[PDB]
């Protein structure tokens with residue numbers, strides 16, 4: 001055994017050892033219990049970053065833990081290949097997106113392999129390959145025929161200078177982020193998934209997910225935003241019907257979730273697009289400008305609550321059907337045309353948004369709810385104003401004294417009898433638009449024929465192949481400028497026709513890839529029936545919390561779609577969900593005429609730390625704040641340089657030890673040094689142990705007659721095995737498992753293991769430690785295990801807890817007072833000559 005730990009020697013040999021034995025190349029083996037551990041597959045954007053290493057290390061810890069416990073473990077990897085990165089790389093480098101993508105894949109695949117992840121590379125998929133995306137084209141056509149996918153006109157932000165559609169997050173002050181030109185809102189036909197048809201299923205099935213973090217479930221419930229409220233109609237007043245046609249001349253209809261406060265409504269508010277807004281504004285230039293400023297707005301939903309709410313009175317009036325109050329209609333910028341009826345009532349006393357709106361414009365506030373003897377201050381909001389559960393109605397006439405639920409049904413009965421309203425269930429969730437006006441994505445399998453309409457490509461003709469020898473312009477989607485691609489013949493009539501040139505939302509590829517891993521070479525469908533039945537669902541899923549809403553909701557949706565097609569046998573794709581935090585790092589710059597400097601290029605001073613300096617020279621640097629690793633502040637530490645400097649095991653140890661998965665991990669040079677120094681110590685402990693006499697059979701069985709010191713070390717060992725097992729299995733906190741193995745070795749360090757029995761216990765200690773740590777640092781553990789023991793480590797299995805080692809010793813002595821019934825004296829006085837271990841007599 002080499003004296004000094006040298007990872008560049010041992011790590012490739014171990015990787016070859018695992019690969020030769022094919023421990024990760026798994027099949028549908030009915031004799032071993034399956035375990036499907038999945039990390040979110042990466043965008044192939046060039047190189048691994050520290051987030052990647054953290055995520056796939058967490059995945060591999062859990063995989064190897066289950067492997068050592070005898071499961072048939074599938075841990076597959078692949079490439080989420082379509083999307084904008086390749087498009088912009090094409091624009092900057094004048095290379096094809098595909099060629100750039102396949103090169104990134106080759107380089108990142110090498111990096112993952114050098115880290116030693118126990119991955120079944122025979123199940124590798126790349127979603128930009130027609131062998132993959134043909135199957136989502138297949139499902140698309142099938143759902144299109146059923147109407148689950150449909151084509152509808154929708155409005156988008158057009159940038160007229162850069163000639164492309166822009167996401168709403170990509171609009172600042174009504175202008176495109178790169179171009180800086182005023183965006184134009186335009187109506188174009190687009191494709192939608194009818195996800196709202198599955199809203200109630202998607203909402204309710206969350207309750208099944210007992211091993212998901214509650215905050216993820218809460219975020220999904222809120223995103224779906226189901227509510228049971230009331231449709232309420234207010235009759236338009238005699239004087240306010242000018243310019244209105246239809247039922248809009250008769251009433252204004254609103255939806256509210258608080259009909260128990262209908263007695264407290266003090267005004268009503270409508271969207272800028274509402275007919276009442278249009279008729280009111282026809283002779284009022286200030287209203288026309290307000291209507292225009294609303295329509296020009298572009299507020300993404302994470303910013304709708306954070307925008308200043310503004311309104312304009314219209315001079316038009318409606319009547320509360322329950323008390324008779326004439327109420328003014330306002331136009332307001334928070335009422336969205338498309339949600340509900342584009343019209344709401346306002347109760348400033350019991351809705352905080354209405355409170356603030358009414359405070360701004362000095363609109364009335366009428367308290368109709370009371371919670372105990374709480375004082376109502378019409379000038380200061382209080383939390384209890386919005387209380388649904390423990391409130392009771394006041395100032396409501398014949399409704400006074402009712403709680404929320406019985407008031408709700410009382411209002412519902414009154415409204416329904418006179419025809420002024422009825423209960424209604426609503427959902428915030430919108431349908432999912434999948435059209436993208438972009439090149440590097442899966443083609444939409446629709447052929448447009450002026451005789452036959454929107455026609456799906458027949459299954460015999462799929463895939464519609466994206467041509468790969470394209471170098472994106474900049475001036476619009478290339479597919480629309482390629483007659484060689486879109487000029488085709490119609491599949492139903494055989495005449496001249498045009499392919500759809502929009503591509504699919506790349507969220508689609510990541511909504512089913514976990515099923516494709518089950519049979520990635522299956523040419524007859526999305527997933528083979530036999531494989532889906534064996535593998536079932538993902539047992540454990542690991543990824544970043546930033547995917548908690550959209551990606552997770554889309555994947556659950558696709559699972560239910562595929563189940564209903566008859567392809568899979570599960571309702572939910574992901575049983576356990578572990579969300580990983582971000583990686584942060586200090587930032588450094590230097591002022592010019594700021595140019596942010598990468599940390600691996602900087603060197604720090606010290607004392608016994610003054611400042612920092614650039615490695616290439618010696619000019620000082622500006623140490624600034626710690627934040628997430630990014631291109632923006634050039635504070636991303638290349639994982640390749642960590643591996644080059646210390647080896648894969650040190651990289652993995654640092655990430656697992658520095659922070660629990662949910663927590664932000666802070667890059668630290670000394671921390672990485674600490675992890676490397678522990679691996680040297682681990683190496684030194686085994687080497688010194690074997691230097692003093694070589695391996696022996698590990699201690700096992702009855703421990704009576706072992707010295708107290710060695711019994712104590714066995715107690716620490718088997719308590720450490722139980723702790724680490726609970727840390728990997730239940731808590732999924734890996735730092736405390738490393739700490740526990742560290743404590744075991746510390747106790748071993750202070751124990752004389754030189755005797756014959758001492759060596760046997762030492763062998764037991766070391767054979768456990770290297771297996772307890774193997775999921776985390778498998779290369780050094782693999783090599784150390786082969787020096788201690790000839791059996792194959794994965795066949796030796798997870799260390800067992802020897803409960804006999806956890807039973808503390810017993811000695812029963814009698815205690816008598818005047819002849820009749822240090823260590824034992826203090827305990828018997830807690831109940832004087834002492835005959836050792838047998839008897840004590842309290843002579844008094």
Ligand SMILES: CCCCCc1ccc(-c2cn(CCC[C@@H]3CO[C@H](COS(=O)(=O)NC(=O)[C@@H](N)CC(C)C)[C@@H](O)[C@H]3O)nn2)cc1
Nearest residue numbers: 040041042043049050051055080510543544582583629636
């Ligand atoms: C030279 C470049 C320097 C870059 C510097 C840098 C930048 C960022 C971070 C960082 C990020 N996070 C936060 C956690 C990042 C996780 C990384 O692993 C996985 C792959 O991520 S992905 O490839 O983005 N794919 C995807 O997100 C989709 N293909 C997944 C589908 C299933 C939807 C995901 O689970 C991420 O959520 N923490 N740290 C660290 C370093």
Ligand SMILES: [Mg+2]
Nearest residue numbers: 208209210211
């Ligand atoms: Mg259950």
Ligand SMILES: [Zn+2]
Nearest residue numbers: 449452490493
């Ligand atoms: Zn036709």
